[PDB]
């Protein structure tokens, strides 16, 4: 026993040194012949009015038109942002929704919350209503984030400290993530849907990979759990939110931490990040009601989106980045570009 | 301005819109209930007595009202990572065994269902979300002070080992651990699991806090 | 899914008649409902529209005042109240169902129909009402509108439909370009602003029949003459 112990904390020790090792120059030392993006000015389009609680989750679609939101009210509303139009109002069996995902088909909807299953929604059928297709039950704990690899599988995360990777078709997890030690809060899939990360209640972010089910790389860094966890758009690197406050912006091939994004003024948790289309900018949604806009070569922003009158508890851009849709607890979503 | 298709896509949003203003409605004349408790505290009494894994939901009626009572102690989580979706619940029903104040978890269960107690009284999301604490097990209770004393969970205690006065300091004790007094209260009572008075209070204190509710609504309070 | 309608036969001039449509398999109440009649020679033409929760109806010109349409939605049907009858208004009468919202398919299914004897705006025209076929071509029909379908939200509404010889019209292609659930990839659509093409690849049965192009950018929606290929 003691010798295992004394030889993960020597490997830990050799990974800390591989780490530092490769550390030749910060972020900040290479990105400061950059000219700043200035004052990024956005306005509320859209207001899309229409759920009666806090809405906890949001998606866009892959044609950056529909959206799908999920507020614990019941209700699985898929708006058509440009017109604010309802295309569906699904009812849900439990109203104790956490997370949504829209296909990147379009075909399907995928919900689930603290009943620990996550429904899925065949919107496209021949009687004209969105009737559930499956229910994915083997989770333990709440199921926090789900996201759709394509029309046959899904990649849940829940509170079981645990991520799996189901079939729709047979309903049963083909791959089980194990590995993080607290409740898993949110994910995070590649472009090339390959590999994916997971951050959770142990201030660790893990980096996956889908069709072998082992856990590449970890990064740890943040002093308190984490509560979203989004890709840049290059694939190779991604930034996380913790609840102390401070987007960090890993990478893949360097494995450690590159940048933090903190401001003295904040000290509220972050519930949303989201990078733009290009990766340079860092969009964050915070428990002051707030949604500061980051540079993510810089760190040296706070561009405010203040609309929210309570927590902004989801945000995410479209395919195309034309705009940013943030949901808060006030029961509106809001378009932003 | 519109075509002939996005007048009737308006129409559709339309009757979509009044369908979710008619379930918003349906849904906000009803109690939302929070039971909590450690394990094997009596809480299945509790759901036992409406008599009409995950989350479980309990629908049950009264003399005109609706309730529906959420037991969440089935899923073990970080249960501040999803304590505050609860943060509009009318009341919170909260079970504690009053004869585990002698058993020991190997620590108190006593002491267990205190610390949790001080926990979600406490919290920032039910800062004005009355509790409505139910004692269970008060027989078993009365056996056990009748064999053995109070003094192995509360040592500070040096009333008459009887039952009266014992459980009334068990309720003082829990009231006790409640820092927010302007904002919420305490409605304790000695259930069993034998009547069927218990519907009746909760009944009566969720009447009662419609009626703080309302006093605060409109100003008065 | 099935719409069956009822309420046919033989009706001396003047006078009234109620064509009932029960509807079974679907979520009645969701899908805006269409009568269109057939006359015994020629091609379609529209008659009435409801919408879904009765709030919205429109009627053809020839038809206003004489005709009520109405909906029972506990019932699943669909109701067709038609006075004063004359002898030009016997013909096939379909029932249709149309759902609208982004992205749906409107006019997707069609009823059986119900023979009845009787003892300013959008011109679709058709190029010739018969196309020649011998075995291996491609065969590729015209409707060329008189007003400008592209809307400035970019869709351009016009529709296709098959018409198979003693069956019932089927949907193939939604707003020029969107091939309808069920039907084959030969079936494409092409073309601009009053001018349509509808292109069939690899030459087989199946496929004869008249068809027919409608539009939908305002009521009363008015189809085309028909074009028939045969071999």
């Known amino acids: 026993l003691d010798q295992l112990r004394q030889e993960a904390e020597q490997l830990k020790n050799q990974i800390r040194d591989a780490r530092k090792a490769c550390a030749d120059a910060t972020l900040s030392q290479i990105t400061n012949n950059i000219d700043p993006v200035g004052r990024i000015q956005m306005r509320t389009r859209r207001t899309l009015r229409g759920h009666l609680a806090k809405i906890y989750a949001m998606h866009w679609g892959t044609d950056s038109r529909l959206l799908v939101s999920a507020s614990q009210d019941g209700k699985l509303i898929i708006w058509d942002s440009y017109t604010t139009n309802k295309v569906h109002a699904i009812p849900l069996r439990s109203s104790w929704v956490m997370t949504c995902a829209y296909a990147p088909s379009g075909n399907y909807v995928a919900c689930g919350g603290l009943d620990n299953i996550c429904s899925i929604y065949n919107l496209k059928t021949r009687e004209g209503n969105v009737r559930v297709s499956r229910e994915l039950a083997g989770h333990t704990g709440y199921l926090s984030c789900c996201r759709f690899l394509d029309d046959n599988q899904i990649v849940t995360s829940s509170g079981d400290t645990t991520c799996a990777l189901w079939d729709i078709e047979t309903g049963q997890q083909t791959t089980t993530f194990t590995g993080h030690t607290g409740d898993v809060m949110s994910l995070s899939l590649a472009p090339d849907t390959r590999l994916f990360v997971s951050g959770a209640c142990d201030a660790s972010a893990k980096l996956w990979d889908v069709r072998e089910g082992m856990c590449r790389q970890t990064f740890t860094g943040h002093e308190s759990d984490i509560n979203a966890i989004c890709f840049f758009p290059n694939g190779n690197a991604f930034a996380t939110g913790s609840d102390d406050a401070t987007c960090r912006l890993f990478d893949l091939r360097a494995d450690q931490e590159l940048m933090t994004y903190s401001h003295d003024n904040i000290i509220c948790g972050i519930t949303s990040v989201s990078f733009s289309k290009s990766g340079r900018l860092l969009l964050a949604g915070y428990d002051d009601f707030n949604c500061n806009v980051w540079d993510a070569l810089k760190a040296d922003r706070a561009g405010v989106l203040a609309g929210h009158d309570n927590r902004v508890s989801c945000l995410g851009v479209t395919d195309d980045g034309m705009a940013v849709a943030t949901g808060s607890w006030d029961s509106f979503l809001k378009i932003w570009n | 301005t519109l075509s002939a298709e996005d007048k009737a896509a308006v129409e559709r949003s339309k009757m979509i819109d009044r369908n979710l203003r008619e379930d918003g409605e349906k849904a906000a004349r009803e109690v939302k209930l929070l039971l909590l408790g450690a394990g094997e505290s009596g809480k299945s009494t509790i759901v036992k007595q409406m008599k009409i894994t995950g989350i479980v939901e309990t629908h049950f009626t009264f003399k005109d009202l609706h309730f529906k009572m959420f037991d969440v102690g089935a899923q073990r989580s970080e249960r501040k990572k999803w304590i505050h979706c609860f943060e509009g619940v009318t009341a919170i029903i909260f079970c504690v065994a009053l004869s585990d104040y002698d058993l020991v978890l190997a620590m108190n269960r006593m002491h267990e269902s205190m610390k949790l107690f001080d926990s979600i009284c406490n919290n920032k999301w039910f800062t004005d979300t009355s509790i409505i604490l139910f004692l269970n097990k008060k027989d078993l209770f009365e056996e056990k002070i009748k064999k053995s004393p109070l003094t192995i969970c509360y040592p500070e205690y040096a009333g008459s080992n009887t039952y009266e006065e014992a459980a009334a300091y068990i309720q003082c004790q829990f009231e006790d651990l409640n820092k927010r007094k302007d904002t919420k209260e305490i409605y304790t009572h000695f259930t069993c699991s034998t009547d069927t008075k218990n519907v009746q209070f909760v009944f009566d204190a969720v009447t009662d806090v419609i009626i703080k509710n309302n006093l605060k609504d409109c100003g008065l309070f | 899914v099935q719409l069956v309608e009822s309420g046919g036969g033989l009706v001396q001039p003047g006078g009234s008649r109620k064509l009932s449509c029960s509807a079974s398999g679907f979520a009645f109440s969701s899908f805006g409902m269409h009568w269109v009649r057939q006359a015994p020679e020629k091609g379609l033409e529209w008659v009435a529209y409801?919408?879904?929760?009765?709030?919205?109806?429109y009627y053809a010109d020839t038809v206003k005042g004489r005709f009520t349409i109405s909906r029972d939605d506990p019932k699943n049907t669909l109701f067709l109240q038609m006075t004063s009858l004359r002898s030009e208004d016997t013909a096939m009468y379909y029932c249709?169902?149309?759902?609208?919202?982004?992205?749906?398919?409107?006019?997707?299914?069609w009823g059986q129909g119900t023979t009845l004897t009787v003892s300013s705006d959008i011109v679709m025209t058709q190029a010739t009402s018969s196309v020649p076929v011998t075995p291996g071509e491609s065969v590729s029909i015209s409707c060329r509108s008189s007003k400008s379908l592209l809307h400035s939200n970019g869709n351009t509404y016009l529709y296709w439909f098959l018409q198979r010889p003693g069956q019932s019209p089927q949907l193939l292609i939604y707003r020029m370009s969107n091939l309808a659930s069920g039907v084959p990839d030969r079936f494409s659509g092409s073309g601009s602003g009053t001018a349509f093409t509808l292109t069939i690849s690899r030459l087989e049965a199946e496929d004869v029949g008249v068809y027919y192009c409608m539009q939908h950018l305002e009521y009363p929606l008015t189809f085309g003459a028909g074009t028939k290929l045969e071999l």
């Open positions: 249709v169902r149309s759902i609208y919202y982004y992205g749906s398919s409107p006019f997707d299914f």
């Open positions: 409801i919408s879904s929760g009765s709030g919205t109806i």
